[PDB]
Scaffold this active site. Structure first.
Site, PDB file in Angstrom:
ATOM      1  N   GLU A   1     -16.163   3.604   3.314  1.00  0.00           N
ATOM      2  CA  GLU A   1     -15.942   4.452   2.136  1.00  0.00           C
ATOM      3  C   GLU A   1     -17.100   4.245   1.143  1.00  0.00           C
ATOM      4  O   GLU A   1     -17.628   5.208   0.581  1.00  0.00           O
ATOM      5  CB  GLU A   1     -14.594   4.108   1.473  1.00  0.00           C
ATOM      6  CG  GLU A   1     -13.391   4.412   2.344  1.00  0.00           C
ATOM      7  CD  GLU A   1     -12.140   3.656   1.952  1.00  0.00           C
ATOM      8  OE1 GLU A   1     -12.014   2.478   2.360  1.00  0.00           O
ATOM      9  OE2 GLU A   1     -11.289   4.234   1.239  1.00  0.00           O
TER      10      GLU A   1
ATOM     11  N   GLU B   1      -7.798  -2.860  -0.030  1.00  0.00           N
ATOM     12  CA  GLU B   1      -8.512  -2.030  -0.990  1.00  0.00           C
ATOM     13  C   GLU B   1      -8.154  -2.305  -2.437  1.00  0.00           C
ATOM     14  O   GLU B   1      -6.984  -2.475  -2.773  1.00  0.00           O
ATOM     15  CB  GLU B   1      -8.314  -0.539  -0.670  1.00  0.00           C
ATOM     16  CG  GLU B   1      -8.935  -0.080   0.639  1.00  0.00           C
ATOM     17  CD  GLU B   1      -8.186   1.045   1.328  1.00  0.00           C
ATOM     18  OE1 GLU B   1      -8.037   2.128   0.718  1.00  0.00           O
ATOM     19  OE2 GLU B   1      -7.763   0.849   2.490  1.00  0.00           O
TER      20      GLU B   1
ATOM     21  N   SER C   1      -5.728   2.346  12.282  1.00  0.00           N
ATOM     22  CA  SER C   1      -4.576   2.132  13.163  1.00  0.00           C
ATOM     23  C   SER C   1      -3.314   2.529  12.359  1.00  0.00           C
ATOM     24  O   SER C   1      -2.837   1.764  11.510  1.00  0.00           O
ATOM     25  CB  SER C   1      -4.469   0.708  13.711  1.00  0.00           C
ATOM     26  OG  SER C   1      -4.693  -0.274  12.713  1.00  0.00           O
TER      27      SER C   1
ATOM     28  N   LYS D   1      -7.620  10.278  -3.359  1.00  0.00           N
ATOM     29  CA  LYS D   1      -8.112   9.011  -2.874  1.00  0.00           C
ATOM     30  C   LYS D   1      -9.298   9.349  -1.975  1.00  0.00           C
ATOM     31  O   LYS D   1      -9.094   9.706  -0.818  1.00  0.00           O
ATOM     32  CB  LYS D   1      -6.997   8.286  -2.120  1.00  0.00           C
ATOM     33  CG  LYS D   1      -7.299   6.816  -1.892  1.00  0.00           C
ATOM     34  CD  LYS D   1      -6.238   6.173  -1.054  1.00  0.00           C
ATOM     35  CE  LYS D   1      -6.785   4.987  -0.318  1.00  0.00           C
ATOM     36  NZ  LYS D   1      -5.690   4.155   0.232  1.00  0.00           N
TER      37      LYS D   1
ATOM     38  N   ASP E   1       2.064   4.980   2.459  1.00  0.00           N
ATOM     39  CA  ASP E   1       0.955   5.355   3.348  1.00  0.00           C
ATOM     40  C   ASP E   1       1.466   5.217   4.795  1.00  0.00           C
ATOM     41  O   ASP E   1       2.158   6.128   5.259  1.00  0.00           O
ATOM     42  CB  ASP E   1      -0.342   4.545   3.056  1.00  0.00           C
ATOM     43  CG  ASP E   1      -1.582   4.914   3.885  1.00  0.00           C
ATOM     44  OD1 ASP E   1      -1.611   6.034   4.453  1.00  0.00           O
ATOM     45  OD2 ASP E   1      -2.559   4.104   3.906  1.00  0.00           O
TER      46      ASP E   1
ATOM     47  N   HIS F   1     -12.165  -6.360   8.990  1.00  0.00           N
ATOM     48  CA  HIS F   1     -13.232  -5.413   9.327  1.00  0.00           C
ATOM     49  C   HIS F   1     -12.881  -4.545  10.536  1.00  0.00           C
ATOM     50  O   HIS F   1     -12.344  -3.451  10.372  1.00  0.00           O
ATOM     51  CB  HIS F   1     -14.581  -6.130   9.517  1.00  0.00           C
ATOM     52  CG  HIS F   1     -14.641  -7.042  10.704  1.00  0.00           C
ATOM     53  ND1 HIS F   1     -15.082  -6.595  11.937  1.00  0.00           N
ATOM     54  CD2 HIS F   1     -14.332  -8.356  10.801  1.00  0.00           C
ATOM     55  CE1 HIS F   1     -15.022  -7.642  12.741  1.00  0.00           C
ATOM     56  NE2 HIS F   1     -14.574  -8.724  12.104  1.00  0.00           N
TER      57      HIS F   1
ATOM     58  N   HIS G   1      -8.428  11.136   1.965  1.00  0.00           N
ATOM     59  CA  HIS G   1      -9.497  11.326   2.934  1.00  0.00           C
ATOM     60  C   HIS G   1      -9.145  10.416   4.136  1.00  0.00           C
ATOM     61  O   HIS G   1      -8.062   9.810   4.162  1.00  0.00           O
ATOM     62  CB  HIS G   1     -10.846  10.911   2.296  1.00  0.00           C
ATOM     63  CG  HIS G   1     -10.973   9.439   2.021  1.00  0.00           C
ATOM     64  ND1 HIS G   1     -12.165   8.775   2.226  1.00  0.00           N
ATOM     65  CD2 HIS G   1     -10.042   8.538   1.603  1.00  0.00           C
ATOM     66  CE1 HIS G   1     -11.933   7.512   1.899  1.00  0.00           C
ATOM     67  NE2 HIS G   1     -10.667   7.322   1.521  1.00  0.00           N
TER      68      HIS G   1
ATOM     69  N   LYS H   1      -2.232  12.847   4.246  1.00  0.00           N
ATOM     70  CA  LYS H   1      -3.323  12.963   5.211  1.00  0.00           C
ATOM     71  C   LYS H   1      -3.027  14.156   6.116  1.00  0.00           C
ATOM     72  O   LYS H   1      -2.063  14.129   6.884  1.00  0.00           O
ATOM     73  CB  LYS H   1      -3.526  11.659   6.026  1.00  0.00           C
ATOM     74  CG  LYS H   1      -3.963  10.456   5.196  1.00  0.00           C
ATOM     75  CD  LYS H   1      -3.664   9.195   5.958  1.00  0.00           C
ATOM     76  CE  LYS H   1      -4.256   7.941   5.379  1.00  0.00           C
ATOM     77  NZ  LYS H   1      -3.746   6.745   6.107  1.00  0.00           N
TER      78      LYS H   1
ATOM     79  N   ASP I   1      -4.465  -1.019  -2.619  1.00  0.00           N
ATOM     80  CA  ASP I   1      -3.942  -0.736  -1.294  1.00  0.00           C
ATOM     81  C   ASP I   1      -4.054  -2.042  -0.500  1.00  0.00           C
ATOM     82  O   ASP I   1      -5.001  -2.208   0.270  1.00  0.00           O
ATOM     83  CB  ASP I   1      -4.634   0.456  -0.604  1.00  0.00           C
ATOM     84  CG  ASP I   1      -4.173   0.739   0.823  1.00  0.00           C
ATOM     85  OD1 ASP I   1      -3.031   0.348   1.178  1.00  0.00           O
ATOM     86  OD2 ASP I   1      -4.947   1.349   1.581  1.00  0.00           O
TER      87      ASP I   1
ATOM     88  N   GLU J   1      -0.109   0.731  -3.166  1.00  0.00           N
ATOM     89  CA  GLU J   1       0.123   1.457  -1.918  1.00  0.00           C
ATOM     90  C   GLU J   1       0.370   0.451  -0.795  1.00  0.00           C
ATOM     91  O   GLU J   1      -0.438  -0.450  -0.580  1.00  0.00           O
ATOM     92  CB  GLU J   1      -1.106   2.336  -1.638  1.00  0.00           C
ATOM     93  CG  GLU J   1      -1.139   3.107  -0.333  1.00  0.00           C
ATOM     94  CD  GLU J   1      -2.488   3.757  -0.101  1.00  0.00           C
ATOM     95  OE1 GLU J   1      -2.918   3.821   1.073  1.00  0.00           O
ATOM     96  OE2 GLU J   1      -3.153   4.129  -1.097  1.00  0.00           O
TER      97      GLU J   1
HETATM   98 MG   LIG Z   1      -2.951   1.871   3.445  1.00  0.00          MG
HETATM   99 MG   LIG Z   2      -4.179   2.710   6.640  1.00  0.00          MG
END
Ligand SMILES: [Mg+2]
Ligand SMILES: [Mg+2]
Ligand SMILES: [Mg+2]
Ligand SMILES: [Mg+2]
Lengths: 424, 420
Positions: free
Chosen positions: A204, A163, A43, A387, A311, A156, A364, A336, A241, A284
């Protein structure tokens, strides 16, 4: 070279999550064919390029991509057959012009990026050049230090932060750095079970346990770095992150597992404390999407020693990046491709950040594929950082294998980013 | 022109983050074939063994540098100037060169890599798609996939899979299975929790009964708008790994236990209530008396697949054919070691009325050879996992490409995949 476009064909394939996605093939007069699979995931917002999904609930729960496939087999193909694919800029500015919308909503960011990427690949094969050389020229040779996603959280039992990644800074090559990370990720797989938990991957490849404190994933990671035989700081560093824009909710930042709240000033204070305790080199989205005042304060307090990566805050947007560069709101941007929509515009963002003293972190997506463009793009621009996630799922591993190949191919010319990747 | 000019091997990573060998074969034409040869590992001795370094200072001994040296030196010197279009000849040269019957000298991984890369290089030289170069003008059958949607046991009944037999094309069967995999990921959340995924896509939830995973799947099929038996059918791989023999058939947690004869009677119960078309490793690795009983009881209605029972070995495939121990074999490229030997095992089963189920390994790669191999042989069935990881999606995506390339020539196996 015969780099004139003969055919542009698109098909609906599946991503790493099993959702439909677009794969584009650009065929040149020469006979060379470039192929690209476009990603997606999570999102995201704040002025971004819009991808085109079908909305037909009777096919893939509305997630079909046939409308985007049509735009390529008809609209784009008609406009570009006979165009020179070796002219990336001119082609991308032709794709943007054909769309007419500023967010690529008429044709789809996915149709535009697919053609944008396949065109370059077709041309690289025509010149007989490797994609990183075709894209970045004669001085494209820097192998990135990967931000490897070994531990997960967020949403989730959770975990406030999303991260937790490791970075093999001290390695001599990408090959050895990937081994280090692989070895530590496997040691963390041993440690996790040997502490009373379960071990299956995510999107990931990171492990997502149910932990009691927000410092616990950092403590576990520290143990896995040590018990694997690696020195924290000198050899392995941490990149986080937290994706704080998730726990923002009408001001304040809500830390459910730590039973706290406060404002940006005290959220910054939290990062300063954590940074003093763990060998964290990168953070991040430490603050929310539009907390522009907060970001500048985080930059002032940590920007001298910590890489602060925009980000969701920057969304690979050249106008947002120009503001954050001026405002002194961060020192790094996550890149991205599909958030911007074209190869030319991606390279423009990368160069705008890089020339302002910022670092560009090529990322990615949640729903990736067998496509490994980001591996050639990260070397082409000598970004120094990628990343791509855990050394686990083939969505991620495929990129690692391409970086292994790019390094091998470069031979003596190859040079690993190391501590030089960072501005610290 | 199709003569070998160079053989280069490198160490890459598989879908589990473990070292694996990638082989590049370059022809005088300028064409390069590239193949990633990863590894699964179910049970010993596999009858074809891969070469792992054993040096614990690198990847905890799972490194494959020795196999890379076998390819860059032994295999490279021996094959330069060989015609790569001569598959059988090249493959018998690789077998000669190794000298061992288990491929332990050079490594099964070294031999298969060169074996597959040499084919890819030749296919590109003739400018033919791999399935056409492999299978000729009649290579056109798209397989019904064995899509894993549920697990249980080790390597985190064992595997529970769906098969879209009713579809008119691979493309629609792929959608059917994907929609049902997404519909079930909602039924697990609405009737419990724990959802994660990995390594094998079909998430393993802690369930109360052994007949219940079938009830979850059967609900998700109807909840997605699909008709069981007619459109979607169930394929089971119970496994019999932890369910060891002597004492025979250790069924836990149900406390039923013994024996081999009673075990067969259980499968007849599930099959008469639920639509189960296929059963794989329903009995143990070397319980030859059991398999033969299992075949006489429901071999005329159910597909019985010899996985760990046969280990892609020709010598014991011949035995099980005569003994009438099964009516299907699971084929694993890495398990036999070469292309010529795989095709040989595929043909032997197919021509004696059995079916060939082409399968992936536990640690896979971006390598997609099994998609071209399954169409080339017109096998009618593939077992390449869930519609989730790229290690598995790469294969489904390739099958979509193969179908499209075939145009009007393409034919989805469907109900015809099975001999029932
Ligand atoms: Mg992020
Ligand atoms: Mg994100
Ligand atoms: Mg097995
Ligand atoms: Mg099995």
């Amino acid at each position: 070279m015969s780099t004139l476009i003969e055919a542009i064909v698109a098909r609906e394939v599946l991503d790493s999550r099993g959702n439909p996605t677009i794969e584009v093939d650009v065929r040149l007069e020469s006979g060379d064919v470039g192929r690209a699979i476009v990603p997606s995931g999570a999102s995201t917002g704040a002025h971004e390029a819009l991808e085109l999904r079908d909305g037909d609930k009777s096919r893939y729960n509305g997630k079909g991509v046939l409308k985007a496939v049509q735009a390529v087999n008809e609209d784009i193909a008609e406009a570009l057959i006979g165009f020179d694919a070796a002219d990336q800029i001119a082609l991308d500015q032709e794709l943007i012009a054909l769309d007419g919308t500023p967010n690529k909503s008429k044709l789809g960011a996915n149709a535009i990026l697919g053609v944008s990427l396949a065109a370059a690949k077709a041309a690289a094969a025509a010149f007989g050049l490797p994609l990183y050389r075709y894209l970045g020229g004669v001085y494209a040779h820097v192998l990135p230090v990967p931000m490897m996603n070994i531990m997960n959280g967020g949403q989730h039992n959770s975990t406030d932060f999303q991260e937790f990644m490791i970075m093999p800074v001290g390695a001599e090559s990408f090959r050895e750095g990937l081994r280090w990370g692989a070895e530590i990720y496997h040691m963390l797989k041993k440690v996790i079970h040997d502490r009373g938990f379960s071990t299956t991957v995510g999107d990931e490849g990171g492990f997502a346990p149910s932990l009691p404190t927000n410092d616990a994933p950092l403590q576990l990671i520290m143990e896995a770095i040590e018990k694997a035989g690696y020195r924290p700081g000198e050899q392995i560093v941490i990149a986080l992150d937290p994706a704080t824009t998730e726990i923002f909710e009408d001001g304040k930042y809500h830390l459910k597992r730590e039973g706290r709240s406060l404002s940006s000033a005290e959220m910054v204070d939290y990062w300063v404390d954590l940074v003093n305790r763990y060998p964290i080199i990168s953070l991040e989205d430490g603050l929310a999407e539009d907390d522009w005042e907060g970001w500048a304060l985080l930059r002032a307090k940590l920007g001298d020693r910590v890489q602060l990566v925009g980000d969701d805050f920057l969304v690979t947007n050249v106008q947002r990046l120009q503001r954050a560069i001026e405002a002194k709101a961060a020192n790094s941007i996550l890149i991205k491709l599909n958030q911007i929509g074209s190869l030319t515009e991606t390279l423009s963002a990368i160069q705008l950040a890089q020339r302002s003293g910022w670092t560009a972190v090529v990322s990615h997506r949640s729903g990736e594929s067998e496509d490994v463009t980001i591996a050639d793009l990260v070397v082409a621009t000598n970004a120094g950082q990628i990343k791509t996630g855990a050394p686990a799922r083939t969505d991620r591993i495929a990129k690692y294998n391409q970086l292994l190949r790019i390094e091998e191919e470069l031979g003596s010319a190859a040079r690993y980013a190391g501590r030089s990747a960072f501005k610290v």
